[PDB]
Amino acid sequence: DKATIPSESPFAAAEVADGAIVVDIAKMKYETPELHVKVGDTVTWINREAMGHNVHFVAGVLGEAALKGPMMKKEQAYSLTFTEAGTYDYHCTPHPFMRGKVVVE
Ligand SMILES: [Cu+]
């Protein structure tokens, strides 16, 4: 696996770590569609709108299986810690026109 999951559950936006690397989700878009981080960094997505959203990496991207994140409700968050350099594309499961990528360097 090229990512670990701190919390399998979404969690509250106020519970996001001090200094987190945050991608906001609003207006049916990931607000940072191309994020560059370093090996070992944790990225946190935070849903800022009513509509449920997740992040979904298909099989072979972050590991053998697809990494289909849990649906985040409004003001919920979800983190992934990236452990290997590469380019990792993702989309939103119910709204697959929403696309982003994490580039881990
Ligand atoms: Cu979505």
Side-chain angles (χ1 to χ4, degrees):
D1 232 290
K2 296 184 187 195
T4 62
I5 308 177
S7 178
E8 302 282 344
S9 175
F11 54 98
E15 295 174 333
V16 171
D18 281 2
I21 299 167
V22 167
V23 178
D24 283 324
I25 315 173
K27 304 96 162 56
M28 305 294 300
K29 307 159 201 195
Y30 302 113
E31 288 193 356
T32 304
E34 179 175 337
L35 178 74
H36 289 250
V37 302
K38 319 170 286 307
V39 174
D41 284 351
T42 300
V43 175
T44 300
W45 291 263
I46 305 181
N47 187 8
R48 305 297 191 172
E49 62 181 353
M51 167 86 290
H53 296 292
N54 74 341
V55 297
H56 181 168
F57 300 76
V58 302
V61 181
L62 292 173
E64 298 86 5
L67 201 168
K68 181 189 290 172
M71 298 304 316
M72 288 171 273
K73 302 189 98 85
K74 191 177 178 191
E75 297 295 326
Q76 300 196 303
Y78 179 69
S79 299
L80 292 172
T81 298
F82 290 86
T83 67
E84 178 170 336
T87 294
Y88 305 110
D89 293 282
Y90 61 95
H91 70 275
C92 180
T93 302
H95 317 124
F97 58 82
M98 295 177 60
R99 299 269 161 174
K101 75 178 187 200
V102 182
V103 181
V104 180
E105 307 164 341

